[model samples]
Structure formats: C-alpha cells, structure tokens
Target: SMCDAFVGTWKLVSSENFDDYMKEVGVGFATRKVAGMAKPNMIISVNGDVITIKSESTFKNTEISFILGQEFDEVTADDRKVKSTITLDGGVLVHVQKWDGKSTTIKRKREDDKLVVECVMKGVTSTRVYERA
Candidate 1:
C-alpha cells in the first residue's frame, strides 16, 4: 500500500494551506505569493532502493532522491539553499529539513484521491492537502 502511490508520475493540481506554511518557514511575501499561486509539478519514481522526486515550478526546479527506510537523508537543490530528508514515521513519509539553525520535518501521505502533507518544527505544525493532477 505504501509503495503503490509512491511509484508513479503525479503532478500537483492544487495545494491548500501551504501558503502559510511557506510564510512560517521564512519565505518572503513575494516568493510566498508566487509559490502560493503557482502549480508545482511533481514526478516520483521508485526503483528498488531509490526514490526520486522532481519538483518543477515557475520559479525554480529541483530533483531530489533518497533511499527508503534508510538515513541517506540529505537533499540539495536551488543553488544549495535547501537540504532535507525523507523518513518514515509509521505510515507517514517524514522530511526532516535543516535550515537557518532550525530543523523541520515534513510528513506526507496519499489517501484515495488526495495527498496530505504536514510540516512540523519549533513546536508547531502545519497541514496541507492536495488533489491528484
């Protein structure tokens, strides 16, 4: 069940509640607006031990990969300003990100026809929802 929705080409249709998330993470208003209004594309592929993600947006492009259930947990993209990890918290895929002396973990899941993601850091968490594209 976990690996099925994980191994396909899925695009981003709409994201709800993620705008505030970017803001809380130190994203400026203009950049947040660009991210908030734009549709970010996603391509997820899994081959045995490796999982890859390509995030395409009007402002930036990123490709990242990790090993399932392991600690190969450093993601670099956008001129090396971002680095993160994907981990499993029970059934939720958690991304623990390091930035600006603070660490944040983003959890993601697919349910039926939707994607659910949550960002947790500094004793706070934000949830976002998305539909299949």
Candidate 2:
C-alpha cells in the first residue's frame, strides 16, 4: 500500500543547496553549520489519515504531525511559526508552509528505494535524497 511504503525510518543520502535554503529561511549561522554538517534522519509514521514525521539530527530534533488536506500551525527549526498543510497529489505528497507572510513548498515522492524531497523558498530550490533505513 502507498501509505505502508511511506511509513519507515529514512536516512539522509545526499543534499543539494541545503545551506542556501536554510539561510533564506533565516537560520542562524551556527545552526546552519551544525545542520549542514549533521547527518539527519527521519522516522515517518502513518495511522489512518494522520501522519507524523520525526526529524532527528545533532543540532535539533522536531516532530510534525498533521492530517492530509488539513492545515495546521508549524514552528520550523528556526523557531518561526508557519501555517502548514499537506496534500497528496497523484503519487506525491506536497507540503505548503507560510510564515511571516512568506511561503515555501516542499514536494515529496518515492523513487526506487529512495525518497526525494524538493524544497522551494524565495525562488531557490533544494533537493534532498533519503533512503529507507
């Protein structure tokens, strides 16, 4: 099942332009340094219509829980509050976040043994690759 496939522990494989994206989002210099240097991991859990994602790393650890197609408030790693929502588009999961009147979008999709996450903010896009652990 699609939901079953998404429920697993995933380890970071690679990242592209992550520093730039974090900078644009107003992450502090030291935090960005730690985040960039750390190997982050994610645990995704799904039950019925709800999904929870636990992001773990050396810098900070956070968990986000939400239901599909429902909007909720989110506080990012930088401690900024954002209104966020997730929706399933085709076979992909899309997250839209709005903070301080600024907007960002993240699209997640599964590839062969990999989860590809594309994040866009202030016109800069970053790609992060994750493999099931």
Candidate 3:
C-alpha cells in the first residue's frame, strides 16, 4: 500500500529489533558485534525494466534486480539456492525470495519512515529496519 516507498536511499540505524534480526540471519557473535556497531548502507533505484538495489554492510556488498514477477538470481544473498524477485503483495513491496530450493518468501515493507524487511531463509532469517539519513 506504499506508493513510491521504495524509491529512496536509506541508512541503517540501530535496530529496535536487532537481536532477533541478527539471530534470524545466523549472524555469529563477532560479526554481530561489528554489525551491531556499524551502520549499513543501501541504495534503491528503478528504471523502466527492473527494480534493483544494492546492500552494503561492513562485511559484504551485493546488488540484485528483477522484473515485477521475474526471477533475477536463483539464490539468496547469503548463498542459499532459491528464486529471487520483487513484487507488490497486497500493495506492499515485498521480496519473495525462495529459499532452500523450496518456497519460503521474505517480505519487505515500508512503514512510518522505516524500511522493515523480513526474511525466511534456510535457518537465518530476520527483520532489519532502516531509516533515512
């Protein structure tokens, strides 16, 4: 239900939902330690063909794109094999990333100035929230 909600840049803030988020992503203690202290950066942009974005954290950086209902990558960013794409489910922008060669979808939504993302990957899944700088 968020029009143009995905059309901006975002800076990672300390997550109000950090512990659960990190735990869902299987983040180890040391990595989480750094992640907990650092702010991740993300850029979201769109053209006529596909919706694309890049995730930049202290540890890794990656980019992905896909048509509304088309597949871009056959795996998750964390290396799990699954189809990935971005779609608006019930008016909310969501990334239904299939995990483990099955059908577990991670939904991302924007609400109240926070970019709330939820993942249902293999064993590592979590909700990460970001805000504008």
Candidate 4:
C-alpha cells in the first residue's frame, strides 16, 4: 500500500516559516504565538480504506480520519471548521481544507529518512520536517 511508508510515529525535527503560513490561514496573533512554540509528533495509521493522522503536542492535539477521496468535516487545531479531503498523488499525501471561501493545502511525502510536510495558504508556504520515531 502507498500508505505503508507513513504508518508510524514521526517527530517534528524542524519547522520553517510556520507562523507566516498560519497568519495567511487567518490564525490570530495570540494563537499563532503559541502554535509557533509547539512541536508536534504525527502518528499515521491505515486500517482498510481509512487513514488516520494524529498530531500530538503539549499545546494541542488534533486528529483526522478519512477514506481517500472522501470529504469530511474537520475542526482544525486553530479551531477553524472546514471541509477536508485527502488524496494520494504519486506517493504524496495531499490534504486540502476549505472554509469561508478560503482554503489551504498540505502535502506530506516521505523523503529518505524524513517525512516532509509542506503547508500552503495564499502565497505563503511553510515546511515542517519530521523523522520517524
């Protein structure tokens, strides 16, 4: 399965320009400050057709489970309620969330020894790198 590579825990190694990315997503200043300071571990699992991604952090924890190509309601870590969908493209997990006529895309791919996550909103892009735990 394409999901097999991501079926384990990954710890955040580095985050670049995350605050700016969150700002573009309409996150508040206070929340952005807190979010910028927190590092989260991502746990990924696949059971049948359902894939679950869990973000665990001291500040906040969030999880989303869905079958590929299915849309689901998601309340993000920053508390935005959005319609979300996940799909796999060439082994990359592409996630998109839409709300209030706004949207963001997250692409997660395994690169050698790391899981690389790219977050995009408006014109800003942030990269968060994680290593298997």
What is each predicted model's overall lDDT from 0 to 1?
A: 0.67, 0.87, 0.67, 0.92
Error of 1 at 85 (Å): 2.0
Structure candidate 1, residue pairs in collision: none
Candidate 4 overall Cα lDDT vs. reference? 0.92
Off by over 4 Å in 4: 77-79
**TM-score, predicted candidate 3 vs. hidden true structure:** 0.69
TM-score of each: 0.75, 0.91, 0.69, 0.95
Query: What is the overall TM-score of model 2 with all chains considered together?
Result: 0.91
Better of 1 and 3 by TM-score: 1
lDDT of 2 at 32: 82
lDDT tens readout by residue for model 3, 41-108: 88877777667788787767767776787766653334356566677888667766555455555676
Model 2 spans > 4 angstroms off: none
Model 2, C-alpha of 9: deviation from truth (Å): 0.8
Q: Count the backbone clashes (under 3 Å) in each candidate.
A: 0, 0, 3, 0
Best by lDDT: 4
lDDT winner between candidates 1 and 2: 2
* Candidate 3 local distance difference test against the native: 0.67
Q: Candidate 3: where is the Cα deviation over 4 Å?
A: 1-3, 16-38, 74-79, 121-125
lDDT of 1 by residue, 5-115 (tens): 755655665455676666567767776777677676677777776788787778778787787655544543222255566776677777777766666678879877777
lDDT of 2 by residue, 14-88 (tens): 999999998887778887888889788999899777899999987779899899899998875576788999988
For 1-133, candidate 4 gives per-residue lDDT tens digits of 9899989999999999999999999898889998899889989999999999999988899888999999999985565889998999999999999998889999999999899999999889999999999
